[PDB]
Each structure stands twice: as C-alpha cells, then as structure tokens.
Amino acid sequence: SILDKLVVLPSGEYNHSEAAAMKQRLEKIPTSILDALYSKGVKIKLTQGAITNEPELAYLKGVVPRGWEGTGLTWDDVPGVSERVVAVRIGYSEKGKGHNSLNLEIHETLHAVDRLVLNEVSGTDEFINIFNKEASVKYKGDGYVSAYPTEYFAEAASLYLYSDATRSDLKDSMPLTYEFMAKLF
C-alpha cells in the first residue's frame, strides 16, 4: 500500500491500535489520489501529541487561528491541519474531538487533494454552483462548511468516501454534490 510510505507514524511512542484504525480509514480514499498526493511531497503525519509538537508546525505554537480572537484558542488546540503536510492527532478522528467533521483524517487529507492534486476543483464554477445550491442543507449557519467551498468540498467528499451509509445520506440530501463526487472518485 501507498499508505506505508505516505502515512508517517511517530518515531516516539504512540497508540498502536488507534493509529492503525486511522490508517485503515485513509484506505477509503482512492489509491490513484493517494499516489498523486505522495508525488507532490505530501505526508500524512499521525501525531501522538498536539500537532504543533511536529517540528514543521512548531511555528504555530501560541498563535490564534483566524476568526478566533478573544476565545483563548491557539493552534496548539487544533487537532488537524492541511498545508503541504497533513497532520492529524491520534484519537481525535470522531466528530466532537476538537472539530465537527465526520472524520478528521479524511477531511484534512481531502484539502491537500483539492489544492495539490485537483487544481483547486472546489473553486471551479461547476463546484461553486453546487455549493451555492446544496451546502445549506446540512450546514446552514455554521460559518464554515456553508461559508467556504473548500470546506464543503472536504466535508461532502468525506460523506462520500467514509461509508455506504454516509454516501446514501449524501445521495438523498445533496444529489448534485453526490453526482460530482461519484464522477470525481
């Protein structure tokens, strides 16, 4: 599997079974897309501590994420991020673990796929049209998935890839998004 080289586990001590479970869920992403991620120098780092403990993310320590002034939140509290590295904290996959995604590792990986593999497909007129019609169905008022096409892309692709139940739910609730995802994957 491409995941044996794309997924970087900690060199120190880590929760073995949880890291394996996350690695297994990343297999829901098509192999061709994972291959393409690796060719762009992308690494999916599963971290045992705060993502900011990673040398390349240490610069974010004590910095306030945009939109969060006056809340006491810093990047140290954020369980996952996606830039040229995808960093996800081990044990924080489920909704409510410091984020509101269906699955943290799939969600954050799909941002890197959008940016570095698919030429920002979330920003195309076709996807914008879909986002304007359907992002409101499940996410109205969240100022996040319903506010940014990149977020709707990552979360709606997560619904598509995670399980058969979440995909069926997407097909019924957001049919234009389901059609776009099926054509893409």
Please name which of 140, 79, 126 lies closest in space to residue 104, comparing C-alpha atoms.
79
CA atoms of 182 and 172, how far apart (whole Å): 14
Residue 16 assigned to a binding site: no
What is the separation of C-alpha 158 from the centre of its chain, rounded to a whole number of angstroms?
8
Active-site residue, from 13, 94, 108, 120: 108
Residues that bind Zn ion (CB under 5 A): 151, 154
β-pairing, 80-82 with 85-89? antiparallel
Residue 144 assigned to a binding site: yes
Residue 81 CB, nearest distance to Zn ion (Å)? 9
Q: Which residue, 31 or 143, has its beta carbon nearer to Zn ion?
A: 143
Is 108 designated active site? yes
Residue 82 CB, nearest distance to Zn ion (Å)? 7
43-47 sheet: strands from edge to edge? 7-8, 43-47, 85-89, 80-82
Residue 99 assigned to a binding site: no
Q: Which residue, 13 or 140, has its beta carbon nearer to Zn ion?
A: 140
Q: Which residue, 13 or 106, has its beta carbon nearer to Zn ion?
A: 106
Residue 101 CB, nearest distance to Zn ion (Å)? 7
Q: Which residue has the tokens 């499940």?
A: 138
CA atoms of 22 and 106, how far apart (whole Å): 9
Residue 107 assigned to a binding site: yes
CA atoms of 178 and 170, how far apart (whole Å): 6
Residue 111 CB, nearest distance to Zn ion (Å)? 6
Q: Which residue, 14 or 77, has its beta carbon nearer to Zn ion?
A: 77
Catalytic residues: 108
Q: Which residues are documented as binding site for Zn(2+)?
A: 107, 111, 144, 151
